Amino acid sequence: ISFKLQEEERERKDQYVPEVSALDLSRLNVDNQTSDLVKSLGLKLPLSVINVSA
């Protein structure tokens, strides 16, 4: 079933964005070969190479 009122409230409730969040910097665990990749590509980034445990 699909009526115009339902599709319009769907568009209204789909166009809503929850502000600025989930992408802002919190300090990217860009690991070492990715750092090698981006430095070969010659691009600047917030270097953060982490060494996980076993």
What string marks each residue from 1 to 40 as x (binds other proteins by CB under 8 A) or -? -------------xxxxx-x-xx----x-xx-xx--xx--
CA distance 32 to 1: 52
- Nearest to residue 33, comparing CAs of 10, 16, 11, 50? 50
User: Minimum Å distance from CB 30 to other proteins?
Assistant: 6
Structural tokens at position 21: 């969040």
Contacts with other proteins, residue ranges (CB under 8 A): 14-18, 20, 22-23, 28, 30-31, 33-34, 37-38, 41, 43-45
